[PDB]
From Swiss-Prot, chain A:
Residue numbers bearing the N6-acetyllysine modification: 13, 19, 23, 33, 45, 49
Annotated phenotype, changing residue 39 to M: In FTD1; ultrastructural and biochemical characteristics indistinguishable from Alzheimer disease; accelerates aggregation of tau into filaments
Consequence of substituting residue 7 to N: In FTD1; minimal parkinsonism; very early age of onset
Function: Promotes microtubule assembly and stability, and might be involved in the establishment and maintenance of neuronal polarity. The C-terminus binds axonal microtubules while the N-terminus binds neural plasma membrane components, suggesting that tau functions as a linker protein between both. Axonal polarity is predetermined by TAU/MAPT localization (in the neuronal cell) in the domain of the cell body defined by the centrosome. The short isoforms allow plasticity of the cytoskeleton whereas the longer isoforms may preferentially play a role in its stabilization.
Organism this protein belongs to: Homo sapiens (Human)
Glycyl lysine isopeptide (Lys-Gly) (interchain with G-Cter in ubiquitin) crosslink, residue number(s): 13, 19, 23, 33, 45, 49
Tissue-by-tissue expression: Expressed in neurons. Isoform PNS-tau is expressed in the peripheral nervous system while the others are expressed in the central nervous system.
Positions of post-translational Phosphoserine modification: 7, 26
Protein name according to UniProt: Microtubule-associated protein tau
UniProtKB/Swiss-Prot annotation, chain B:
Segments for region (Disordered): 90-111
Domain comment quoted from the record: The MREI motif is common among all beta-tubulin isoforms and may be critical for tubulin autoregulation.
Keyword line: Acetylation, Cytoplasm, Cytoskeleton, GTP-binding, Isopeptide bond, Magnesium, Metal-binding, Methylation, Microtubule, Nucleotide-binding, Phosphoprotein, Ubl conjugation
Feature: compositional bias, Acidic residues: 95-111
Similarity annotation: Belongs to the tubulin family.
Protein name (Swiss-Prot/TrEMBL): Tubulin beta chain
Single GO BP term: mitotic cell cycle
Post-translational modification: Some glutamate residues at the C-terminus are polyglycylated, resulting in polyglycine chains on the gamma-carboxyl group. Glycylation is mainly limited to tubulin incorporated into axonemes (cilia and flagella) whereas glutamylation is prevalent in neuronal cells, centrioles, axonemes, and the mitotic spindle. Both modifications can coexist on the same protein on adjacent residues, and lowering polyglycylation levels increases polyglutamylation, and reciprocally. Cilia and flagella glycylation is required for their stability and maintenance. Flagella glycylation controls sperm motility.
Main function: Tubulin is the major constituent of microtubules, a cylinder consisting of laterally associated linear protofilaments composed of alpha- and beta-tubulin heterodimers. Microtubules grow by the addition of GTP-tubulin dimers to the microtubule end, where a stabilizing cap forms. Below the cap, tubulin dimers are in GDP-bound state, owing to GTPase activity of alpha-tubulin.
Amino acid sequence: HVPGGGSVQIVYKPVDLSKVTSKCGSLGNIHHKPGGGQVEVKSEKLDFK
Amino acid sequence: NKNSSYFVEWIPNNVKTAVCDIPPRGLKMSATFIGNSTAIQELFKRISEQFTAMFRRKAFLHWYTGEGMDEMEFTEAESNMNDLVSEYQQYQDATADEQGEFEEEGEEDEA
C-alpha cells in the first residue's frame, strides 16, 4: 500500500460586481431650459388718428 | 495590529468577544480562550503517521478484529485524517490576494 492520503480540494471562488444595474434620474440630462418671455406686448404709442 | 502573521487574513477579523458580569467564586475578573491556529495540523499529522507505521505491519490488530471490527475501517479512518491534515496544510498560507470571474478571449493578434 502507499499511505500519505489521496487528495483534497480547497473551497475558493473568483469575484465580480456582476455589471449591476440601478435607476438614475440625474443621468438623463445635460442641458438647462431656455428663459421665459421678457418682452412687453400691451404697450401703445397713443396716436390721435 | 501587533501581528497579522499568526491570524488568517482572508477572515477579516478572526475574533468573537463576550463580557459576562459575574466572575468565578474567589476571583475578581477572568477570560476563557478558544482558538484554531492551523499549526494544529501537526497533531493529526503525528496521529496518522504513527497509525500508518504500526498498521503497515498489522501490529495489535488481532485484539481489534476479535471484537469483530473490520480490517478495511483502519484504512478508512487514517485516509480521512490524511484528508483532514491536508485541509489545514492547504488553508495555511492561503490567499487574501484577489481573482476575478474573467475568462480567456481570442480578441487580439500577436504583438
